[PDB]
Amino acid sequence: VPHKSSLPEGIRPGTVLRIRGLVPPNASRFHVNLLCGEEQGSDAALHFNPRLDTSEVVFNSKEQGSWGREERGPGVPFQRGQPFEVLIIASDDGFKAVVGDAQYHHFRHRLPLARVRLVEVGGDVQLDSVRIF
């Protein structure tokens, strides 16, 4: 079951999402979605998708059900069995992903930031906390 964090007032530049958890020892993939609503099929402003099986971290958007052009971070700074800390930071020009102690990727806004209303974490992941600062 996905972890669904409603944010009815939305997010703004300076919003920090702090995600702490652990990658299960048998994990293949997990994701963090910033979605525009609570309904099924809602558009995704950001889809942040570590893929342990294919050694990549995919970034994308989704509109009217269709995935956009994939972007990728460098390598895969996640390991089966190991804890992680991810920051997703909103700015006027996009999202910054931070993993561990380092800036990881910058994802330029594709959808208006003001549309985001929900953070969804799904897939093969153990979540300890998802915090909005």
mmCIF file of N, CA and C in Angstrom:
data_model
loop_
_atom_site.group_PDB
_atom_site.id
_atom_site.type_symbol
_atom_site.label_atom_id
_atom_site.label_comp_id
_atom_site.label_asym_id
_atom_site.label_seq_id
_atom_site.Cartn_x
_atom_site.Cartn_y
_atom_site.Cartn_z
ATOM 1 N N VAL A 1 0.830 -1.202 0.000
ATOM 2 C CA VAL A 1 0.000 0.000 0.000
ATOM 3 C C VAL A 1 0.868 1.258 0.000
ATOM 4 N N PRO A 2 0.591 2.176 -0.933
ATOM 5 C CA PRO A 2 1.350 3.428 -1.023
ATOM 6 C C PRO A 2 1.131 4.352 0.182
ATOM 7 N N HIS A 3 2.140 5.163 0.470
ATOM 8 C CA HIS A 3 2.088 6.173 1.512
ATOM 9 C C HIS A 3 1.609 7.463 0.862
ATOM 10 N N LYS A 4 0.396 7.903 1.189
ATOM 11 C CA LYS A 4 -0.170 9.064 0.512
ATOM 12 C C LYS A 4 -0.299 10.262 1.454
ATOM 13 N N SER A 5 0.517 11.286 1.216
ATOM 14 C CA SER A 5 0.527 12.486 2.053
ATOM 15 C C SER A 5 -0.264 13.618 1.399
ATOM 16 N N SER A 6 -1.496 13.861 1.850
ATOM 17 C CA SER A 6 -2.271 14.976 1.298
ATOM 18 C C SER A 6 -1.686 16.314 1.727
ATOM 19 N N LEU A 7 -1.614 17.258 0.795
ATOM 20 C CA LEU A 7 -1.179 18.614 1.090
ATOM 21 C C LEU A 7 -2.162 19.586 0.445
ATOM 22 N N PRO A 8 -3.325 19.779 1.070
ATOM 23 C CA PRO A 8 -4.413 20.537 0.432
ATOM 24 C C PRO A 8 -4.026 21.959 0.025
ATOM 25 N N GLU A 9 -3.110 22.595 0.752
ATOM 26 C CA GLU A 9 -2.722 23.967 0.451
ATOM 27 C C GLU A 9 -1.593 24.023 -0.591
ATOM 28 N N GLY A 10 -1.132 22.855 -1.018
ATOM 29 C CA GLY A 10 -0.087 22.772 -2.028
ATOM 30 C C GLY A 10 1.284 23.081 -1.463
ATOM 31 N N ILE A 11 2.253 23.273 -2.351
ATOM 32 C CA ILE A 11 3.611 23.582 -1.947
ATOM 33 C C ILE A 11 4.100 24.800 -2.723
ATOM 34 N N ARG A 12 5.195 25.379 -2.250
ATOM 35 C CA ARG A 12 5.708 26.645 -2.767
ATOM 36 C C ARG A 12 7.214 26.575 -2.851
ATOM 37 N N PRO A 13 7.836 27.529 -3.559
ATOM 38 C CA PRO A 13 9.302 27.566 -3.479
ATOM 39 C C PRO A 13 9.764 27.670 -2.026
ATOM 40 N N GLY A 14 10.764 26.873 -1.667
ATOM 41 C CA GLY A 14 11.169 26.751 -0.276
ATOM 42 C C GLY A 14 10.554 25.572 0.476
ATOM 43 N N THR A 15 9.595 24.887 -0.142
ATOM 44 C CA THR A 15 9.077 23.665 0.471
ATOM 45 C C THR A 15 10.131 22.575 0.390
ATOM 46 N N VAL A 16 10.385 21.935 1.523
ATOM 47 C CA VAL A 16 11.325 20.819 1.581
ATOM 48 C C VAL A 16 10.594 19.546 1.992
ATOM 49 N N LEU A 17 10.694 18.527 1.148
ATOM 50 C CA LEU A 17 10.194 17.196 1.478
ATOM 51 C C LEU A 17 11.366 16.355 1.947
ATOM 52 N N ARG A 18 11.305 15.880 3.186
ATOM 53 C CA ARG A 18 12.387 15.062 3.746
ATOM 54 C C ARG A 18 11.901 13.632 3.872
ATOM 55 N N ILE A 19 12.520 12.729 3.121
ATOM 56 C CA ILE A 19 12.089 11.344 3.093
ATOM 57 C C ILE A 19 13.172 10.438 3.642
ATOM 58 N N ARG A 20 12.862 9.748 4.740
ATOM 59 C CA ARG A 20 13.793 8.842 5.381
ATOM 60 C C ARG A 20 13.236 7.441 5.348
ATOM 61 N N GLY A 21 14.076 6.495 4.981
ATOM 62 C CA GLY A 21 13.629 5.120 4.912
ATOM 63 C C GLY A 21 14.769 4.159 4.699
ATOM 64 N N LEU A 22 14.417 2.965 4.236
ATOM 65 C CA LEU A 22 15.387 1.915 4.015
ATOM 66 C C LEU A 22 14.957 1.105 2.809
ATOM 67 N N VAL A 23 15.926 0.727 1.990
ATOM 68 C CA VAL A 23 15.658 -0.108 0.831
ATOM 69 C C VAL A 23 15.622 -1.569 1.262
ATOM 70 N N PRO A 24 14.489 -2.252 1.044
ATOM 71 C CA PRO A 24 14.402 -3.655 1.472
ATOM 72 C C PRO A 24 15.475 -4.546 0.826
ATOM 73 N N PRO A 25 15.850 -5.638 1.512
ATOM 74 C CA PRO A 25 16.983 -6.413 1.005
ATOM 75 C C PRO A 25 16.703 -7.087 -0.343
ATOM 76 N N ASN A 26 15.430 -7.210 -0.720
ATOM 77 C CA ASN A 26 15.061 -7.801 -2.001
ATOM 78 C C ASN A 26 14.477 -6.793 -2.971
ATOM 79 N N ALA A 27 14.694 -5.504 -2.717
ATOM 80 C CA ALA A 27 14.008 -4.467 -3.517
ATOM 81 C C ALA A 27 14.432 -4.432 -4.981
ATOM 82 N N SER A 28 13.480 -4.086 -5.845
ATOM 83 C CA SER A 28 13.786 -3.782 -7.238
ATOM 84 C C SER A 28 13.647 -2.289 -7.535
ATOM 85 N N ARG A 29 12.486 -1.720 -7.228
ATOM 86 C CA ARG A 29 12.218 -0.304 -7.535
ATOM 87 C C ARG A 29 11.302 0.344 -6.515
ATOM 88 N N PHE A 30 11.470 1.641 -6.290
ATOM 89 C CA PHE A 30 10.458 2.393 -5.546
ATOM 90 C C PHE A 30 10.365 3.806 -6.111
ATOM 91 N N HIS A 31 9.309 4.519 -5.760
ATOM 92 C CA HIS A 31 9.170 5.876 -6.261
ATOM 93 C C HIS A 31 8.548 6.849 -5.276
ATOM 94 N N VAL A 32 8.792 8.128 -5.552
ATOM 95 C CA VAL A 32 8.152 9.238 -4.866
ATOM 96 C C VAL A 32 7.482 10.081 -5.944
ATOM 97 N N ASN A 33 6.167 10.246 -5.832
ATOM 98 C CA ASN A 33 5.411 11.033 -6.799
ATOM 99 C C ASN A 33 4.872 12.306 -6.174
ATOM 100 N N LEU A 34 5.059 13.435 -6.854
ATOM 101 C CA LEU A 34 4.325 14.644 -6.503
ATOM 102 C C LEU A 34 3.162 14.751 -7.477
ATOM 103 N N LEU A 35 1.948 14.539 -6.985
ATOM 104 C CA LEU A 35 0.746 14.466 -7.822
ATOM 105 C C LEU A 35 -0.160 15.683 -7.657
ATOM 106 N N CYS A 36 -1.061 15.869 -8.608
ATOM 107 C CA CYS A 36 -1.812 17.108 -8.666
ATOM 108 C C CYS A 36 -3.198 16.974 -8.065
ATOM 109 N N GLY A 37 -3.501 15.792 -7.554
ATOM 110 C CA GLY A 37 -4.822 15.548 -7.010
ATOM 111 C C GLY A 37 -4.913 14.169 -6.399
ATOM 112 N N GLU A 38 -6.053 13.896 -5.774
ATOM 113 C CA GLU A 38 -6.269 12.632 -5.079
ATOM 114 C C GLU A 38 -6.887 11.550 -5.965
ATOM 115 N N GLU A 39 -7.418 11.938 -7.118
ATOM 116 C CA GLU A 39 -8.078 10.957 -7.982
ATOM 117 C C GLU A 39 -7.077 10.010 -8.663
ATOM 118 N N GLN A 40 -7.519 8.796 -8.991
ATOM 119 C CA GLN A 40 -6.684 7.912 -9.800
ATOM 120 C C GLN A 40 -6.370 8.598 -11.104
ATOM 121 N N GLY A 41 -5.154 8.395 -11.598
ATOM 122 C CA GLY A 41 -4.772 8.915 -12.893
ATOM 123 C C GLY A 41 -4.355 10.370 -12.860
ATOM 124 N N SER A 42 -4.290 10.948 -11.659
ATOM 125 C CA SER A 42 -3.859 12.332 -11.485
ATOM 126 C C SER A 42 -2.496 12.562 -12.123
ATOM 127 N N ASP A 43 -2.289 13.751 -12.687
ATOM 128 C CA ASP A 43 -1.005 14.118 -13.291
ATOM 129 C C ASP A 43 0.112 14.131 -12.250
ATOM 130 N N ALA A 44 1.322 13.799 -12.684
ATOM 131 C CA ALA A 44 2.500 13.847 -11.816
ATOM 132 C C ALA A 44 3.435 14.966 -12.237
ATOM 133 N N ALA A 45 3.603 15.947 -11.353
ATOM 134 C CA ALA A 45 4.594 17.002 -11.539
ATOM 135 C C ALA A 45 6.014 16.438 -11.482
ATOM 136 N N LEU A 46 6.205 15.448 -10.621
ATOM 137 C CA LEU A 46 7.485 14.781 -10.490
ATOM 138 C C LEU A 46 7.258 13.331 -10.108
ATOM 139 N N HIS A 47 8.009 12.451 -10.768
ATOM 140 C CA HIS A 47 8.086 11.025 -10.475
ATOM 141 C C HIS A 47 9.581 10.773 -10.304
ATOM 142 N N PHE A 48 9.984 10.425 -9.082
ATOM 143 C CA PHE A 48 11.366 10.190 -8.699
ATOM 144 C C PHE A 48 11.488 8.694 -8.413
ATOM 145 N N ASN A 49 12.266 7.976 -9.227
ATOM 146 C CA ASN A 49 12.152 6.510 -9.298
ATOM 147 C C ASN A 49 13.492 5.779 -9.260
ATOM 148 N N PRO A 50 14.023 5.531 -8.051
ATOM 149 C CA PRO A 50 15.208 4.674 -7.955
ATOM 150 C C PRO A 50 14.904 3.245 -8.385
ATOM 151 N N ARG A 51 15.750 2.737 -9.275
ATOM 152 C CA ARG A 51 15.619 1.406 -9.841
ATOM 153 C C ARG A 51 16.885 0.625 -9.558
ATOM 154 N N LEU A 52 16.831 -0.220 -8.539
ATOM 155 C CA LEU A 52 18.007 -0.968 -8.123
ATOM 156 C C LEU A 52 18.314 -2.033 -9.152
ATOM 157 N N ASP A 53 17.271 -2.561 -9.782
ATOM 158 C CA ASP A 53 17.461 -3.657 -10.719
ATOM 159 C C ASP A 53 18.198 -3.215 -11.988
ATOM 160 N N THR A 54 17.938 -2.000 -12.455
ATOM 161 C CA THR A 54 18.587 -1.488 -13.661
ATOM 162 C C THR A 54 19.593 -0.366 -13.397
ATOM 163 N N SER A 55 20.002 -0.237 -12.136
ATOM 164 C CA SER A 55 21.064 0.685 -11.729
ATOM 165 C C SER A 55 20.888 2.111 -12.238
ATOM 166 N N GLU A 56 19.716 2.685 -11.989
ATOM 167 C CA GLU A 56 19.432 4.026 -12.463
ATOM 168 C C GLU A 56 18.441 4.712 -11.529
ATOM 169 N N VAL A 57 18.330 6.027 -11.659
ATOM 170 C CA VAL A 57 17.264 6.767 -10.984
ATOM 171 C C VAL A 57 16.600 7.586 -12.054
ATOM 172 N N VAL A 58 15.348 7.257 -12.343
ATOM 173 C CA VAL A 58 14.597 7.902 -13.410
ATOM 174 C C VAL A 58 13.770 9.049 -12.829
ATOM 175 N N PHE A 59 13.726 10.153 -13.572
ATOM 176 C CA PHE A 59 12.918 11.319 -13.255
ATOM 177 C C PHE A 59 11.926 11.526 -14.390
ATOM 178 N N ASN A 60 10.660 11.787 -14.078
ATOM 179 C CA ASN A 60 9.705 12.069 -15.158
ATOM 180 C C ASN A 60 8.490 12.826 -14.659
ATOM 181 N N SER A 61 7.672 13.258 -15.612
ATOM 182 C CA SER A 61 6.367 13.819 -15.333
ATOM 183 C C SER A 61 5.299 12.947 -15.981
ATOM 184 N N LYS A 62 4.044 13.156 -15.608
ATOM 185 C CA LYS A 62 2.951 12.412 -16.251
ATOM 186 C C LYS A 62 1.779 13.345 -16.474
ATOM 187 N N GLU A 63 1.306 13.410 -17.716
ATOM 188 C CA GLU A 63 0.144 14.237 -18.033
ATOM 189 C C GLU A 63 -0.844 13.460 -18.891
ATOM 190 N N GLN A 64 -2.110 13.512 -18.490
ATOM 191 C CA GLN A 64 -3.210 12.789 -19.131
ATOM 192 C C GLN A 64 -2.868 11.310 -19.279
ATOM 193 N N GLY A 65 -2.221 10.761 -18.259
ATOM 194 C CA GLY A 65 -1.859 9.360 -18.249
ATOM 195 C C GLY A 65 -0.562 9.003 -18.950
ATOM 196 N N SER A 66 0.026 9.947 -19.674
ATOM 197 C CA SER A 66 1.190 9.610 -20.479
ATOM 198 C C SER A 66 2.478 10.126 -19.853
ATOM 199 N N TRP A 67 3.437 9.224 -19.685
ATOM 200 C CA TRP A 67 4.764 9.619 -19.211
ATOM 201 C C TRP A 67 5.468 10.536 -20.198
ATOM 202 N N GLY A 68 6.201 11.506 -19.661
ATOM 203 C CA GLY A 68 6.979 12.430 -20.471
ATOM 204 C C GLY A 68 8.348 11.897 -20.869
ATOM 205 N N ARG A 69 9.237 12.804 -21.250
ATOM 206 C CA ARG A 69 10.616 12.423 -21.569
ATOM 207 C C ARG A 69 11.376 12.085 -20.291
ATOM 208 N N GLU A 70 11.977 10.896 -20.218
ATOM 209 C CA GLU A 70 12.729 10.524 -19.005
ATOM 210 C C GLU A 70 14.016 11.322 -18.871
ATOM 211 N N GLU A 71 14.304 11.754 -17.642
ATOM 212 C CA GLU A 71 15.617 12.267 -17.268
ATOM 213 C C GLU A 71 16.251 11.273 -16.310
ATOM 214 N N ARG A 72 17.562 11.354 -16.123
ATOM 215 C CA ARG A 72 18.203 10.465 -15.161
ATOM 216 C C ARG A 72 19.240 11.166 -14.299
ATOM 217 N N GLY A 73 19.286 10.797 -13.026
ATOM 218 C CA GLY A 73 20.415 11.158 -12.197
ATOM 219 C C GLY A 73 21.624 10.284 -12.498
ATOM 220 N N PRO A 74 22.772 10.622 -11.898
ATOM 221 C CA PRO A 74 23.965 9.788 -12.091
ATOM 222 C C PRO A 74 23.876 8.510 -11.266
ATOM 223 N N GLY A 75 24.075 7.361 -11.899
ATOM 224 C CA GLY A 75 24.140 6.110 -11.168
ATOM 225 C C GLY A 75 22.950 5.793 -10.266
ATOM 226 N N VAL A 76 23.229 5.142 -9.141
ATOM 227 C CA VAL A 76 22.162 4.778 -8.221
ATOM 228 C C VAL A 76 22.664 4.822 -6.770
ATOM 229 N N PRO A 77 22.379 5.931 -6.072
ATOM 230 C CA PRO A 77 22.906 6.128 -4.721
ATOM 231 C C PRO A 77 21.978 5.523 -3.668
ATOM 232 N N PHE A 78 21.580 4.283 -3.927
ATOM 233 C CA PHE A 78 20.748 3.462 -3.065
ATOM 234 C C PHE A 78 21.272 2.038 -3.122
ATOM 235 N N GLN A 79 21.108 1.315 -2.029
ATOM 236 C CA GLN A 79 21.575 -0.062 -1.952
ATOM 237 C C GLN A 79 20.604 -0.914 -1.151
ATOM 238 N N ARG A 80 20.312 -2.113 -1.645
ATOM 239 C CA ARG A 80 19.445 -3.040 -0.913
ATOM 240 C C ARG A 80 19.938 -3.221 0.521
ATOM 241 N N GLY A 81 19.010 -3.137 1.466
ATOM 242 C CA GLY A 81 19.332 -3.246 2.880
ATOM 243 C C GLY A 81 19.755 -1.963 3.585
ATOM 244 N N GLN A 82 20.058 -0.907 2.824
ATOM 245 C CA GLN A 82 20.654 0.306 3.395
ATOM 246 C C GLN A 82 19.647 1.448 3.574
ATOM 247 N N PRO A 83 19.806 2.223 4.653
ATOM 248 C CA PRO A 83 18.977 3.404 4.878
ATOM 249 C C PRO A 83 19.304 4.523 3.908
ATOM 250 N N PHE A 84 18.339 5.401 3.686
ATOM 251 C CA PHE A 84 18.595 6.564 2.855
ATOM 252 C C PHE A 84 17.893 7.785 3.423
ATOM 253 N N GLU A 85 18.367 8.949 3.000
ATOM 254 C CA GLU A 85 17.659 10.196 3.216
ATOM 255 C C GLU A 85 17.643 11.000 1.933
ATOM 256 N N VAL A 86 16.441 11.334 1.498
ATOM 257 C CA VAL A 86 16.232 12.108 0.286
ATOM 258 C C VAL A 86 15.523 13.420 0.634
ATOM 259 N N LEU A 87 16.019 14.526 0.088
ATOM 260 C CA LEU A 87 15.306 15.791 0.118
ATOM 261 C C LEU A 87 14.794 16.085 -1.288
ATOM 262 N N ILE A 88 13.533 16.472 -1.398
ATOM 263 C CA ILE A 88 13.040 17.064 -2.645
ATOM 264 C C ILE A 88 12.695 18.496 -2.280
ATOM 265 N N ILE A 89 13.397 19.443 -2.902
ATOM 266 C CA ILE A 89 13.295 20.853 -2.542
ATOM 267 C C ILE A 89 12.674 21.603 -3.699
ATOM 268 N N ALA A 90 11.616 22.358 -3.434
ATOM 269 C CA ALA A 90 10.951 23.116 -4.481
ATOM 270 C C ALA A 90 11.573 24.493 -4.599
ATOM 271 N N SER A 91 11.811 24.925 -5.835
ATOM 272 C CA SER A 91 12.226 26.303 -6.113
ATOM 273 C C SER A 91 11.355 26.863 -7.228
ATOM 274 N N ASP A 92 11.558 28.131 -7.583
ATOM 275 C CA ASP A 92 10.793 28.735 -8.664
ATOM 276 C C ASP A 92 11.029 28.046 -10.005
ATOM 277 N N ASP A 93 12.218 27.485 -10.209
ATOM 278 C CA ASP A 93 12.539 26.929 -11.527
ATOM 279 C C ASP A 93 12.546 25.398 -11.598
ATOM 280 N N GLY A 94 12.429 24.722 -10.459
ATOM 281 C CA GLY A 94 12.245 23.282 -10.490
ATOM 282 C C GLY A 94 12.414 22.613 -9.143
ATOM 283 N N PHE A 95 12.631 21.300 -9.163
ATOM 284 C CA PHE A 95 12.888 20.539 -7.939
ATOM 285 C C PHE A 95 14.341 20.146 -7.856
ATOM 286 N N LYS A 96 14.935 20.301 -6.676
ATOM 287 C CA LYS A 96 16.262 19.752 -6.437
ATOM 288 C C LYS A 96 16.114 18.459 -5.661
ATOM 289 N N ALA A 97 16.745 17.396 -6.145
ATOM 290 C CA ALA A 97 16.821 16.152 -5.403
ATOM 291 C C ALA A 97 18.178 16.074 -4.708
ATOM 292 N N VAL A 98 18.160 15.806 -3.407
ATOM 293 C CA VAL A 98 19.377 15.603 -2.636
ATOM 294 C C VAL A 98 19.348 14.189 -2.091
ATOM 295 N N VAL A 99 20.448 13.456 -2.240
ATOM 296 C CA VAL A 99 20.520 12.110 -1.681
ATOM 297 C C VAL A 99 21.752 12.073 -0.798
ATOM 298 N N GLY A 100 21.596 11.627 0.446
ATOM 299 C CA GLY A 100 22.735 11.561 1.337
ATOM 300 C C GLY A 100 23.254 12.965 1.577
ATOM 301 N N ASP A 101 24.540 13.178 1.330
ATOM 302 C CA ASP A 101 25.165 14.467 1.612
ATOM 303 C C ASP A 101 25.391 15.325 0.380
ATOM 304 N N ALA A 102 24.763 14.979 -0.740
ATOM 305 C CA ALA A 102 25.070 15.692 -1.974
ATOM 306 C C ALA A 102 23.869 15.969 -2.862
ATOM 307 N N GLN A 103 23.856 17.174 -3.422
ATOM 308 C CA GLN A 103 22.964 17.517 -4.522
ATOM 309 C C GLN A 103 23.005 16.414 -5.575
ATOM 310 N N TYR A 104 21.838 15.896 -5.955
ATOM 311 C CA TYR A 104 21.799 14.731 -6.833
ATOM 312 C C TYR A 104 21.312 15.057 -8.250
ATOM 313 N N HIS A 105 20.184 15.749 -8.364
ATOM 314 C CA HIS A 105 19.637 16.085 -9.688
ATOM 315 C C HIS A 105 18.789 17.337 -9.609
ATOM 316 N N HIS A 106 18.767 18.109 -10.693
ATOM 317 C CA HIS A 106 17.813 19.200 -10.794
ATOM 318 C C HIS A 106 16.813 18.894 -11.893
ATOM 319 N N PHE A 107 15.534 18.924 -11.538
ATOM 320 C CA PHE A 107 14.437 18.642 -12.465
ATOM 321 C C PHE A 107 13.638 19.903 -12.738
ATOM 322 N N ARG A 108 13.775 20.478 -13.933
ATOM 323 C CA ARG A 108 13.062 21.721 -14.217
ATOM 324 C C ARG A 108 11.544 21.494 -14.223
ATOM 325 N N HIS A 109 10.772 22.438 -13.677
ATOM 326 C CA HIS A 109 9.316 22.267 -13.670
ATOM 327 C C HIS A 109 8.784 22.041 -15.082
ATOM 328 N N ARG A 110 7.917 21.042 -15.204
ATOM 329 C CA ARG A 110 7.162 20.792 -16.419
ATOM 330 C C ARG A 110 5.699 21.181 -16.268
ATOM 331 N N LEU A 111 5.116 20.816 -15.128
ATOM 332 C CA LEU A 111 3.770 21.234 -14.741
ATOM 333 C C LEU A 111 3.903 22.392 -13.757
ATOM 334 N N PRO A 112 2.872 23.251 -13.648
ATOM 335 C CA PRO A 112 2.940 24.334 -12.654
ATOM 336 C C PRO A 112 3.071 23.784 -11.243
ATOM 337 N N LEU A 113 4.047 24.284 -10.498
ATOM 338 C CA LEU A 113 4.287 23.864 -9.117
ATOM 339 C C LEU A 113 3.021 23.959 -8.254
ATOM 340 N N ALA A 114 2.232 24.994 -8.513
ATOM 341 C CA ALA A 114 0.999 25.257 -7.784
ATOM 342 C C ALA A 114 -0.065 24.154 -7.916
ATOM 343 N N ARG A 115 0.097 23.235 -8.871
ATOM 344 C CA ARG A 115 -0.849 22.131 -8.997
ATOM 345 C C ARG A 115 -0.644 20.969 -8.033
ATOM 346 N N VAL A 116 0.536 20.870 -7.430
ATOM 347 C CA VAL A 116 0.850 19.725 -6.557
ATOM 348 C C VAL A 116 -0.020 19.732 -5.290
ATOM 349 N N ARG A 117 -0.623 18.591 -4.960
ATOM 350 C CA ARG A 117 -1.541 18.470 -3.818
ATOM 351 C C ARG A 117 -1.338 17.199 -3.000
ATOM 352 N N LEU A 118 -0.414 16.351 -3.441
ATOM 353 C CA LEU A 118 -0.265 15.023 -2.859
ATOM 354 C C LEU A 118 1.143 14.494 -3.111
ATOM 355 N N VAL A 119 1.755 13.936 -2.072
ATOM 356 C CA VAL A 119 3.009 13.199 -2.216
ATOM 357 C C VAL A 119 2.718 11.721 -1.997
ATOM 358 N N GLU A 120 3.100 10.887 -2.963
ATOM 359 C CA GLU A 120 2.807 9.459 -2.879
ATOM 360 C C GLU A 120 4.117 8.683 -2.942
ATOM 361 N N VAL A 121 4.333 7.791 -1.986
ATOM 362 C CA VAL A 121 5.530 6.963 -2.009
ATOM 363 C C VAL A 121 5.086 5.525 -2.155
ATOM 364 N N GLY A 122 5.581 4.851 -3.188
ATOM 365 C CA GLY A 122 5.155 3.491 -3.464
ATOM 366 C C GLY A 122 6.302 2.598 -3.897
ATOM 367 N N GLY A 123 6.006 1.319 -4.114
ATOM 368 C CA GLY A 123 7.021 0.371 -4.552
ATOM 369 C C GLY A 123 7.721 -0.342 -3.407
ATOM 370 N N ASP A 124 8.927 -0.842 -3.685
ATOM 371 C CA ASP A 124 9.732 -1.614 -2.739
ATOM 372 C C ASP A 124 10.550 -0.711 -1.830
ATOM 373 N N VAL A 125 9.939 -0.231 -0.751
ATOM 374 C CA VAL A 125 10.630 0.682 0.149
ATOM 375 C C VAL A 125 10.032 0.573 1.559
ATOM 376 N N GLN A 126 10.877 0.707 2.578
ATOM 377 C CA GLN A 126 10.408 0.855 3.949
ATOM 378 C C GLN A 126 10.519 2.317 4.321
ATOM 379 N N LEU A 127 9.388 2.935 4.644
ATOM 380 C CA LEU A 127 9.365 4.348 5.018
ATOM 381 C C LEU A 127 9.388 4.548 6.516
ATOM 382 N N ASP A 128 10.315 5.374 6.976
ATOM 383 C CA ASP A 128 10.368 5.715 8.388
ATOM 384 C C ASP A 128 9.693 7.055 8.627
ATOM 385 N N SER A 129 9.868 7.990 7.693
ATOM 386 C CA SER A 129 9.171 9.273 7.779
ATOM 387 C C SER A 129 9.177 10.028 6.454
ATOM 388 N N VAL A 130 8.068 10.708 6.193
ATOM 389 C CA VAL A 130 7.964 11.697 5.139
ATOM 390 C C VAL A 130 7.502 12.995 5.776
ATOM 391 N N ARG A 131 8.382 13.997 5.761
ATOM 392 C CA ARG A 131 8.102 15.262 6.435
ATOM 393 C C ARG A 131 8.113 16.434 5.486
ATOM 394 N N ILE A 132 7.229 17.390 5.749
ATOM 395 C CA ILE A 132 7.137 18.600 4.936
ATOM 396 C C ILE A 132 7.574 19.786 5.785
ATOM 397 N N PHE A 133 8.656 20.451 5.382
ATOM 398 C CA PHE A 133 9.177 21.621 6.094
ATOM 399 C C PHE A 133 9.163 22.865 5.211
#
